[PDB]
């Protein structure tokens with residue numbers, strides 16, 4: 571039993587809700603919140619900009635030190651950093667950004683990072699400003715993640731479409 575509330579159960583392990591991941595994180599304080607990161611951990615917009623703003627820029631400060639030490643992530647890769655005031659940990663995961671021409675096949679690799687964590691609050695990878703089809707992102711999620719994932723979909727219109735079209 572966990573503290574997530576109001577989710578629709580899609581499969582054995584995947585749950586979905588129309589919710590603002592920032593507000594969902596502030597309420598639940600999950601062990602792991604997933605950020606829709608880029609390889610530079612520059613949290614400018616989309617989910618990443620929103621998560622970082624909620625930390626008063628502390629996420630960005632920590633991220634800049636991480637990059638200065640380790641260099642950029644790989645597309646499809648991840649790193650674990652602090653969750654600040656939102657969660658115990660933040661798993662920064664880089665899905666392919668279609669508006670940069672990156673290989674959508676890397677979306678499965680990105681979701682594989684979730685399997686290293688028993689329970690996660692997450693957005694749909696590569697959705698929003700990363701330009702991929704969110705229906706496809708949900709499909710890859712369901713077919714790749716085996717751990718318990720609670721998906722927050724900000725746009726109510728998109729949420730209804732994802733549910734109604736889910737196979």
Ligand SMILES: NC(=O)[C@@H]1CCCC[C@@H]1Nc1ncnc2ccsc12
Pocket residue numbers: 590591592615616617620693694696697698699704722723724725728
């Ligand atoms: N979840 C959604 O409806 C959007 C479409 C799917 C993928 C990305 C995007 N997610 C976001 N979630 C929370 N806050 C924000 C702020 C700006 S984008 C965003």
